[PDB]
Amino acid sequence: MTEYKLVVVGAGGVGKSALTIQLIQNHFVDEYDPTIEDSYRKQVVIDGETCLLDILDTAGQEEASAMRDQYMRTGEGFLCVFAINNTKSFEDIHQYREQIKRVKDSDDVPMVLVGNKCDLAARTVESRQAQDLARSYGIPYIETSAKTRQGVEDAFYTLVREIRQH
Amino acid sequence: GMTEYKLVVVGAGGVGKSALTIQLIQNHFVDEYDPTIEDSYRKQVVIDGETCLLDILDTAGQEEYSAMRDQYMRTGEGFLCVFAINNTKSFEDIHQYREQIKRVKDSDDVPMVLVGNKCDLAARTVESRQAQDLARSYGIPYIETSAKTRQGVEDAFYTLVREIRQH
Amino acid sequence: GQMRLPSADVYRFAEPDSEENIIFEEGIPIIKAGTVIKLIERLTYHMYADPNFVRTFLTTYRSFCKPQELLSLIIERFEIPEPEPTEADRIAIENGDQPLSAELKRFRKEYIQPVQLRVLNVCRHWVEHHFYDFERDAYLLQRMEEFIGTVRGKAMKKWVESITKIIQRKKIANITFQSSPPTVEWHISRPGHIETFDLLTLHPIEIARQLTLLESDLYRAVQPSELVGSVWTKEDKEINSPNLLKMIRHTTNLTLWFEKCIVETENLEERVAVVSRIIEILQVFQELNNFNGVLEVVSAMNSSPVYRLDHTFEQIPSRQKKILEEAHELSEDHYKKYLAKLRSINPPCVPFFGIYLTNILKTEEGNPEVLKRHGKELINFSKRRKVAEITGEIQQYQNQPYCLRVESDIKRFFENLNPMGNSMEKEFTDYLFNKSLEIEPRNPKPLPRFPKKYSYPLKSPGVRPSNPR
């Protein structure tokens, strides 16, 4: 069993915790309880290989913004999450991307761009704009809903594949 | 090469039974243990000048899975029947453990030893003479052990191996 | 330069590390032993977060610190004094200017705010995942509500208001799937006809499915509070470990029911059909990764009454002997193959709990509570980490639900199974063994013949599922 250290990052309220708990427990969390730092484990077979995912669920609130280096050092791959009905969260993505690159001193960190809350009709970030950003980073873009499960396994397991091929 | 003996520890739960094998298998002189470690229950020993390998099954903590006892016992060639010297009920349980072992092994003469275990400083309620009389009525040895000083621990296991060798 | 710290005289968590108060294992450090003050300092450390440590500590701390004392210590940790103005600040103020307060601002940003946030994260995890401390001590809950509800200042405000609400919700206290569950399967017994339900009349696929849902629910209900301190083995085990004991007693009852179904079928041909059906149920248990169910069957087949039925075993088809043999081999060599298989499958699964219980008990019995160093007694934290590695493995398999539909009548049938009736254990297991002797006597006694007891067809419908439109 190979162990993979995944970290979920992004602005406050975009659904990092709901995405993680949907993956772990198959349950959608309706409450908005701001995270400080949580961790989860999941044994799962991906492409015929059993592994153990360690998932770090991080704080999006700006009051915690000075405490990120410590978790970025440990992570192998990062889900960079924004909400497709929140343009500011999409603009915040590049700050996370650049901080991860600085901390890990690398241009080539496994990442996936995630546009969450795709169950909501009132979109303000178009798929094309996010896809353009993902291409500029060399990473895939996956739209998800923590509410319906759409794309959730695809997002996490794509990140595993990118750590595996790194 | 060398003979391997499959030994099984049986007896009431909650009264320190697991200390017997832990103290045997332990780094005798460092009080530390990881039971999850592959062969934390195998030990090469020299008994009367003959080297052998002890494989010890102690399912301590699974006592409530009473319908698994037959299966666990079936794996054994010799048995340590353990009670606590400050728990009369665990001593009264011994008769039924022995009867169950005889049925599982389909033999009236299964190698076994009676072990009286001192697991704390609470007052003894089973006197030596009571347990000696019980062991003699069964035709088996009696060994008393301390769960804290390692006294009697090697004697309990080596005596059982001699019972197997002399069966 | 490193930040200066409060004087250790006014703030106890600023004492320097030494071998008299903390010992590390040989890239965050791993603690082998320490004083409770040093453990709490590292639990809420300003340089890094340690979510594993938070779970380990909150799962195991009651063996070295009472809940009331833990709360006092983390409140003490939270209340960090701010440094005095520096010489440069002093000179600015003397000239009527605003000081830069560079060192004060850095100490707030890099010491106080991370430590305080990490104290709140301990409180949050304590309330969310270890709430039993507060259910069992109402005064402890009052103190936690009071502490959280009086934290001032806007940096912590979002988490203070959130934790307040989480506490109130916990005081008065839904699944979505990738696919639809398969259709419920029926054999001789038809829906609603609970009076005909039995081993051979329910569909073997649906027996395995409904027992798996029941055994999964029982597995998932066991909390760490039922395990730490080996409390399921002690005199108050019924009070402290009720979900664990309910789970084990279900497993014992099903094993005994399998045994009773076998030996009360006196006709040889019918008994062969009973044993074959139980092995088919075992096959579906294996397909479902219900290892508890697998071993319920293995235990029944290795019991004294069943194991000796050579005339029955001789007629079991070779492919079914192979299935049973493979399942039996999971337990051999101290569960070597079971452990490897559990670590390779794709959950959901139902683990066998017994190995976890033995390993927790032996870890607690085989390691000392304290380590003595330089005349001091340090809490042996490596021992608690080993226990929490086991409870963490247990919890990891508790997350994933089965995509199977409940059948309320079949569920109730297996919930109410009571093979022993009013009999005590010894009387009942002697009865089973005497039945075994009756139906297949010890050689050289001749094998008797017995009349059939089942009026319905014995042919199995098999264990491959069907799918109409």
Ligand SMILES: Nc1nc2c(ncn2[C@@H]2O[C@H](COP(=O)(O)OP(=O)(O)NP(=O)(O)O)[C@@H](O)[C@H]2O)c(=O)[nH]1
């Ligand atoms: N409709 C919809 N709501 C969602 C989705 N994901 C999250 N939410 C909602 O958005 C809110 C915030 O979700 P949460 O998971 O707490 O977000 P977060 O990014 O972890 N916040 P923080 O950074 O403070 O920890 C919650 O009310 C949650 O139910 C989604 O996919 N669809």
Ligand SMILES: C[C@@H](Nc1nc(Nc2ccc(F)c(Cl)c2)nc2ccccc12)C1CC1
């Ligand atoms: C694979 C199984 N092996 C064996 N089983 C049995 N007997 C038995 C088993 C199942 C039954 F249903 C009935 Cl009726 C009887 N006897 C044996 C005798 C010698 C060697 C192996 C034996 C073990 C899991 C039990």
Ligand SMILES: [Mg+2]
């Ligand atoms: Mg969150």
Ligand code: NA
């Ligand atoms: Na007594």
